[PDB]
Amino acid sequence: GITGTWYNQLGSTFIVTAGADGALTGTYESNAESRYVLTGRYDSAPATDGSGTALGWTVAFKNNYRNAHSATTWSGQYVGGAEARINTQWLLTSGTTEANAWKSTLVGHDTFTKV
Amino acid sequence: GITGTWYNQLGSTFIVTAGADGALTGTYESNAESRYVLTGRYDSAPATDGSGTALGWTVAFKNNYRNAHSATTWSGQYVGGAEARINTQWLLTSGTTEANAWKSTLVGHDTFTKV
Amino acid sequence: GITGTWYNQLGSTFIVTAGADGALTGTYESSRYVLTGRYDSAPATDGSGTALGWTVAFKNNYRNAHSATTWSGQYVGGAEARINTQWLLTSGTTEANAWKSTLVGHDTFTKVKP
Amino acid sequence: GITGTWYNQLGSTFIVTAGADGALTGTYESNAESRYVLTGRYDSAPATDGSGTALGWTVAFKNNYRNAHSATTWSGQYVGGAEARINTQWLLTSGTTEANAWKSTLVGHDTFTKV
């Protein structure tokens, strides 16, 4: 149930394909200039006791039009049902010098839904 | 630079290839039963001011022999500098029922060297 | 403002007093546990929220989970006042297990109970 | 073993007193202008299994001389011995309008020593 289009609570969209071999591939859209490659992995053989399915993905915010010198990783789980959701925590890291490496990484969370 | 074999503090091993317009491919190891696919992205065109290179990757802990029902993401940066390092922060999510979701994610930090 | 009884999404109760010097004191029920913390007693005019944080160690007369949680976040006043936080829960582990010592999560607190 | 003067890798210094039933009280500094109150809690009855002692504390970055409109919380554990250390992860949150809340919280790690 992961394959498809997902929307977060504030304008972002991603299209993902979940491969048989646990791969996650797609596009993240924040114009073709706000589109980025997404790649990741997911548990292709989860438990059927009501647990969600573990997954993660990465976007590096560089495309042929712009480069924010920053990458985000999302770690979380897919939960199906009538109300399917991907609940995540993410880490945003920017390229800094050594002296500023202390302030390099933001942390947040994101919920994605199919509508 | 990023391409190579890296080791963290505890002793795990990650072999990565940096290619494409920023693809990260490879394996994580902690023997063949401990090997898992890794996938991520990186800033293929970092700043020229001495900043590091942002990157992220994902490992889902399922292979042909084992399934921990969980995935880890590393968010961080590559420093070419003195000895090259990758300094990361990570999130490990496990699939949980919805009632135990509050304790699904661990957070920690990892430094990699080619030594 | 911040002073009052707060509840998170999971029904836990946070009774806190905001002092005039930026101290936060009170009690947390996830019986009760002592909480202490700090807040910005003079935030920005500009519509910014108020930065704050607090800690609870999960030890009282009944039980001891050998753990402490810290919440860091901000208060946003409004028709619906709310406190948006990220938290870190650290348990005592041996050295070899330290890598799995810390959970991370997010709590939203509100003056109305779920 | 917690009561005293602790130092992180970045210069920063913290003086804490551990009260008998779990209180942590002290100052965080790096001159008066750079001095701020800290308060936290610790497990006043740790396990005897050689596990460490859980604690946490908070500093809000406001004193009589300046206001960063920020608060940092440290969550971690005291590890005793000759090489006594406090290992932490932290969250730094800044006040932000609702529009900039995604980028309000920094995450990182710090290690404290008695020397």
The ranges assigned to domains in chain D are 1-115
Instruction: Measure in Å the smallest separation between the Cα of C62 and chain A Cα atoms.
Output: 32
- Give residues with Cβ within 8 angstroms of A24, minimum separation 6: A2, A16, A17, A18, A38, A39, A40, A41, A42, A55, A56, A57, B58
| Maximum separation of any 2 CA atoms in chain D, in Å | 48
Q: What top-level class would CATH report for the domain A1-115?
A: mainly beta
- Give residues with Cβ within 8 angstroms of A13, minimum separation 6: A5, A6, A7, A28, A29
Q: Which amino acid is at A115?
A: V
What CA–CA distance (Å, rounded) separates D75 from D54? 8
* C-alpha A102: how far from chain center: 24
- Give residues with Cβ within 8 angstroms of B29, minimum separation 6: B12, B13, B14, B15, B35, B36
What CA–CA distance (Å, rounded) separates A29 from C17? 43
Three-state SS string across chain C, please? Answer: CCCEEEEECCCCEEEEEECCCCEEEEEEECCEEEEEEEECCCCCCCCCCEEEEEEEEEECCCCEEEEEEEEEEEEECCCCCEEEEEEEEEECCCHHHHHHCEEEEEEEEECCCC
Residue of chain D minimizing CA distance to A108: D102
Strands (DSSP E) found in C9-63: 13-18, 23-29, 32-39, 50-59
CB contact (8 A) between residue C55 and residue D73: yes
What CA–CA distance (Å, rounded) separates C17 from C84? 17
CB contact (8 A) between residue B108 and residue C99: yes
Q: Say if strands A23-29 and A35-42 run parallel, antiparallel, or are unpaired.
A: antiparallel
Kindly calculate the radius of gyration of chain B based on its CA atoms and give it in whole angstroms.
15
- Give residues with Cβ within 8 angstroms of A63, minimum separation 6: A32, A33, A35, A36, A37
What CA–CA distance (Å, rounded) separates C15 from C30? 11
**Is residue A102 within 8 Å of residue A81, measured between CB atoms?**
no
> Of B8, B89, B90, which to mutate for an interface test with D (greatest number of D Cβ within 10 Å)?
B89
Instruction: Read off the tokens for B65.
Output: 């022999």
Q: Say if strands B23-29 and B67-79 run parallel, antiparallel, or are unpaired.
A: unpaired
Technique of determination: X-ray
CB contact (8 A) between residue C41 and residue D50: no
What CA–CA distance (Å, rounded) separates D81 from D5? 15
**Is residue A84 within 8 Å of residue B42, measured between CB atoms?**
no
What CA–CA distance (Å, rounded) separates D105 from A100? 15
Work out the end-to-end distance of chain A between its first and last CA atoms, rounded to an integer number of angstroms. Answer: 14
SS3 content of chain B, % helix, strand, coil (to 5): 10, 60, 35
Q: Record the resolution, in angstroms.
A: 1.7
Instruction: Read off the tokens for B45.
Output: 């065109």
What CA–CA distance (Å, rounded) separates A80 from C88? 27
What CA–CA distance (Å, rounded) separates B88 from A105? 9
What CA–CA distance (Å, rounded) separates D58 from B13? 36
Quickly count: other Cβ atoms within 10 Å of residue A4's Cβ. 13
What CA–CA distance (Å, rounded) separates D50 from C105? 27
What CA–CA distance (Å, rounded) separates B64 from B41? 25
C1-114: CATH architecture: Beta Barrel (2.40)
What CA–CA distance (Å, rounded) separates C57 from D20? 13
Residue of chain D minimizing CA distance to B91: D107
CB contact (8 A) between residue D107 and residue B108: no
Residue of chain C minimizing CA distance to B89: C99
